[PDB]
Ligand binder design. Structure first.
Ligand SMILES: C[C@@]1(c2cc(NC(=O)c3ccc(C#N)cn3)ccc2F)Cn2cccc2C(N)=N1
Length: 377
C-alpha cells in the first residue's frame, strides 16, 4: 500500500509565500511549464498569451497534438480573474508517474490580478473534483483523465516542506520515506472540494469550547492553493484570544495578529516555546473515533526576508467561506488524498520545520461522540 516513488521525491519548488509548483510539459514537441499544485480548484489552466509576469507560455500553434474545443471560459475569483479558450493536448509530468495523457486545458488569453509577479509558475493544476470545474462538471479535471487513461491508482499525496520552499507530489502512491508514525484518515465528506469535518480545536491543550458546527461553517476544506489557516469569524476570534494569552510573556502590536505587521527577533533567537501549538481534531473512519493533528508556531509564523534579524508574519486569518486548511496546516504533515477510498490521510511530515523540543504530531484515537452533528447540513 506504500513504497518507494523515487522519481517524484522532491519534485515541488516554490518561492516563500507564493505557491508550490510542479514542472509539467504540454504539447508536441513538449513545452515546459511550472504549474501551481492546487487542491482547492479543478481546472488545468495555463498561460497561453504574453503577460508581463509570464516569461513563457503555452503556444498552441507549435503543438501538433493540440485540438481546439471551440469554447471560451471565464473564471472570476474574489481577488483576480482570467478568461481562456478550451482545448486539449498531451500532458506529462517529467518528475512524475512516467505517463503521457490527453487532458483538457484552459489556455489563458486574458487575466487581471491572477498571475503573481515573481511566483515562477505559469499555470495551475486544479486537483479537486469536477463539481467545481469551470465552466461546469462536463470538463473532466486532469487527475480524473490521468487515472482513466493509465493504470495510476486513484490517489495522490502531498508533502509541502516550507523552510526557497520545496516538497513532493507523489502521483498514484504513498511514499514511505516522507512521513513517520501512523497515517490517520478522515473521510472526504463530499466530492467537490476536499471537504472534511473538524470535531474539536485546542490551543496548547486548552479546548476552544464552541459548538463544533462553528468549526465547519459553512465548510471545512484542505487547500494547497492557500497559504494561511483560515477560520470562520467566530472561531478566528476565539483562537486569537487564546494564542495571545498563551504567548503573553511577550506583547505584540494588534496589527501583528491581523497579519499586517511583522514581528522580529535577533537572528537565531526566535522564542518558539512561548507560542502555543494548535490542534485540530478530525473525524475518524470508525464510529465515535477521532484523531488530531498538531502544528507549531514554525508553521503559523511564516518567515519573511536588517539581515541580522529573523522576521515573521502571523498566518492565521479570517474566512467568510468556512475553514481553509492551507499550507499552514499542510506543511506539518504528509497528506494523502485517497480518492479511491474517499478519505484524506495525515501523518507527521519527515521534512517539517521544528525545534529540538517540539515536533508536529498526529495522534489517535479519541472518543468523540456525535461527530455527524459537527457537519453544517
Ligand atoms: C485558483 C485559486 C488560486 C490559488 C492561488 N494560489 C496562490 O497564489 C498560492 C500562494 C501561496 C501558496 C502557499 N503556500 C499557495 N497558493 C493563486 C491564484 C488562484 F486563482 C483560487 N483561489 C482563491 C482562494 C483560494 C484559491 C485556490 N485554492 N485556488
Amino acid at each position: 500500500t506504500t513504497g518507494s516513488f523515487v522519481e517524484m521525491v522532491d519534485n515541488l519548488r516554490g518561492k516563500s509565500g507564493q505557491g508550490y509548483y510542479v514542472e509539467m510539459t504540454v504539447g508536441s514537441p513538449p513545452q515546459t511549464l511550472n504549474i501551481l499544485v492546487d487542491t482547492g480548484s479543478s481546472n488545468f489552466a495555463v498561460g497561453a498569451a504574453p503577460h508581463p509576469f509570464l516569461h513563457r507560455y503555452y503556444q498552441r500553434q507549435l503543438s501538433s497534438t493540440y485540438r481546439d474545443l471551440r469554447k471560451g471560459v471565464y473564471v472570476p475569483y474574489t481577488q483576480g480573474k482570467w478568461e481562456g479558450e478550451l482545448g486539449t493536448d498531451l500532458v506529462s509530468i517529467p518528475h512524475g508517474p512516467n505517463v503521457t495523457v490527453r487532458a483538457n486545458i484552459a489556455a489563458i488569453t486574458e487575466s487581471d490580478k491572477f498571475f503573481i509577479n515573481g511566483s515562477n509558475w505559469e499555470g495551475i493544476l486544479g486537483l479537486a473534483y469536477a463539481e467545481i470545474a469551470r465552466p461546469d462538471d462536463s470538463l473532466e479535471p486532469f487527475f480524473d483523465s490521468l487515472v482513466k487513461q493509465t493504470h495510476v491508482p486513484n490517489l495522490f499525496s502531498l508533502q509541502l516542506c516550507g523552510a526557497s520552499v520545496g516538497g513532493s507530489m507523489i502521483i498514484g502512491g504513498i511514499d514511505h520515506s516522507l512521513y513517520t508514525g501512523s497515517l490517520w484518515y478522515t473521510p472526504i465528506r463530499r466530492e467537490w472540494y476536499y471537504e472534511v469535518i473538524i470535531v474539536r480545536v485546542e490551543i496548547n491543550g486548552q479546548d476552544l469550547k464552541m459548538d463544533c458546527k462553528e468549526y465547519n461553517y459553512d465548510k471545512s476544506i484542505v487547500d494547497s492553493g492557500t497559504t494561511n489557516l483560515r477560520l470562520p469569524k467566530k472561531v478566528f476570534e476565539a483562537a486569537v484570544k487564546s494564542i495571545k494569552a498563551a504567548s503573553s510573556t511577550e506583547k505584540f502590536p494588534d496589527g501583528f495578529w491581523l497579519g499586517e505587521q511583522l514581528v522580529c527577533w535577533q537572528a537565531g533567537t526566535t522564542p518558539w516555546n512561548i507560542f502555543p501549538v494548535i490542534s485540530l481534531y478530525l473525524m475518524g473512519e470508525v464510529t465515535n473515533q477521532s484523531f488530531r493533528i498538531t502544528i507549531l508556531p514554525q508553521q503559523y509564523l511564516r518567515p519573511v526576508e536588517t539581515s541580522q534579524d529573523d522576521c515573521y508574519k502571523f498566518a492565521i486569518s479570517q474566512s467568510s467561506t468556512g475553514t481553509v486548511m492551507g499550507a499552514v496546516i499542510m506543511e506539518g504533515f504528509y497528506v494523502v488524498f485517497d480518492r479511491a477510498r474517499k478519505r484524506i490521510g495525515f501523518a507527521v511530515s519527515a521534512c517539517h520545520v521544528h525545534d529540538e523540543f517540539r515536533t508536529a504530531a498526529v495522534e489517535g484515537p479519541f472518543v468523540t461522540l456525535d461527530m455527524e452533528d459537527c457537519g453544517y447540513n
